[PDB]
Design a protein around this nucleic acid. Sequence first.
DNA 1: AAAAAAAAAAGGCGCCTATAAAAGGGGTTTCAATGTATCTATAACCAGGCATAAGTACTAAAGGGGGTGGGG
Length: 245
Amino acid sequence: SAVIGGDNEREEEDDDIDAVHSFEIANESVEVVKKRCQEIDYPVLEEYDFRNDHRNPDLDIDLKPSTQIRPYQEKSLSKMFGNGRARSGIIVLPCGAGKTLVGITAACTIKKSVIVLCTSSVSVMQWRQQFLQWCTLQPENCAVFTSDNKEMFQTESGLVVSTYSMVANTRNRSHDSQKVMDFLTGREWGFIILDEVHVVPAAMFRRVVSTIAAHAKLGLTATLVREDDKIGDLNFLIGPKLYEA
DNA sequence: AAAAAAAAAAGGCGCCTATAAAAGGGGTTTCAATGTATCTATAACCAGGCATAAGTACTAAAGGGGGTGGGG
């Protein structure tokens, strides 16, 4: 019959298509970590029919802010555009560079429910303000999902902003990872933005990505490489540096 | 009994009241509205005392990752 997919606890069950992913011996079903949901894009451009039981995106309005981009910023964005993950991957730029502008552009371009993963709450507030262009921070179009408050909303530069996570009963999206597709989490959001992606390689934080169906992934950072060389894992989950300056 | 001083009283003198009508000047004495220093009720002033709200630093906690040294 028609192809179908569904999300189960940070994994994607698959039916009617052997080609798309990998088969599970234990239970005859194609199963994959949530991160490899993107192969579904194969059906998209193709306009191949499938049923998407897996993704539960928060409803997202088609954003149309106007974001001006200097030339280098456009170049990086375009590199990112090629795969929006393999090509998006991570963008490395100096602090002055205006990576956030690129992020904003991707969010506008993508216009899907988005999750931003940041280290601190302050950065979260900062991002939240920028998100205002799509709809002001006061606007519903922006939300914050953390221990303090849990709001699950759509698109923006990232409609949802959350932190990497901490250790506690309640924490950031890492804790939440099964619950809602983010850079961190399960099946709510299509785009995952990692501000300061270098943090992501933490053994725990990395799960945020794996557990995520979110096809598009962007990591922003001044310095990609880690002393630990943990940075290597990013390519699979997030992507490798498609652009650097 | 007498002389003496002190007292009340008389008679006389002068001026007052009410009557009258009608030509120019200067006097003192009392009373009018419009103002200083001091008073009143008001309005407004400081400094000092107590209660509520905002910001502080403080201690307070738990959660973890990474690197170096020692032992097998």
